[PDB]
Design an enzyme around this catalytic site. Sequence first.
Site, short mmCIF file in Angstrom:
data_model
loop_
_atom_site.label_atom_id
_atom_site.label_comp_id
_atom_site.label_asym_id
_atom_site.label_seq_id
_atom_site.Cartn_x
_atom_site.Cartn_y
_atom_site.Cartn_z
N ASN A 84 0.81 -1.22 0.00
CA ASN A 84 0.00 0.00 0.00
C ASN A 84 0.83 1.26 0.00
O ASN A 84 0.34 2.33 0.37
CB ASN A 84 -0.93 0.04 1.21
CG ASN A 84 -1.77 -1.19 1.31
OD1 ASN A 84 -1.61 -1.98 2.23
ND2 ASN A 84 -2.68 -1.37 0.36
N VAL A 91 1.98 7.15 0.78
CA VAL A 91 1.19 6.14 1.49
C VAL A 91 -0.27 6.17 1.05
O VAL A 91 -0.87 7.25 1.01
CB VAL A 91 1.26 6.38 3.01
CG1 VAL A 91 0.35 5.39 3.77
CG2 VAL A 91 2.69 6.30 3.49
N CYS A 92 -0.82 5.00 0.73
CA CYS A 92 -2.24 4.85 0.39
C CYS A 92 -2.99 4.33 1.63
O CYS A 92 -2.81 3.18 2.03
CB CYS A 92 -2.40 3.89 -0.79
SG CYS A 92 -4.11 3.63 -1.35
N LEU A 93 -3.81 5.19 2.22
CA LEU A 93 -4.49 4.89 3.48
C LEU A 93 -5.76 5.74 3.51
O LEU A 93 -5.69 6.92 3.19
CB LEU A 93 -3.59 5.19 4.67
CG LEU A 93 -4.06 4.90 6.09
CD1 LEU A 93 -4.38 3.41 6.24
CD2 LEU A 93 -3.03 5.33 7.12
#
Length: 156
Positions: A84, A91-93
């Site tokens: 992710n 960051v993919c969140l």
Amino acid sequence: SGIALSRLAQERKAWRKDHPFGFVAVPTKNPDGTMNLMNWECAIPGAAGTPWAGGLFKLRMLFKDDYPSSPPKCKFEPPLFHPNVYPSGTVCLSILEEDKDWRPAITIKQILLGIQELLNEPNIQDPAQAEAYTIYCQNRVEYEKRVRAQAKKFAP
Ligand SMILES: O=S1(=O)Nc2ccccc2-c2ccccc21
């Protein structure tokens, strides 16, 4: 932005008073030497007892002028192997997207703990990089081997 700078001063105060052990979060400086609250250098320790243990992972936190309307952009520098994390380091969140789970009340501490939690528990519904995602799905033992090597590489 007075609104952003006021909140970021509050976050800095709160962080210095009480933060999780082993984490770092510090503003940077402008070219004239003054404090730049819009750009922070941070570090997240790997959780003990996990493949990330012993590593200290540096990231930059970049705030827009309309913060806290918007979340900061959080970018590992250098980029990390993780399903992710984009190749760029970003960051993919979901809490880091305004249109998803971001809430203005979310603190820098909650962001950094949220990213630490992400490191040890990938979200297979949100792949951000092909390689780490593919390995996570195909061979978990190989995945952890790669994570341990990376943690050793970034041991302080
Ligand atoms: O000075 S850095 O090695 N350099 C650095 C560069 C980008 C983002 C974070 C950091 C950082 C974070 C915590 C401690 C030390 C550093």
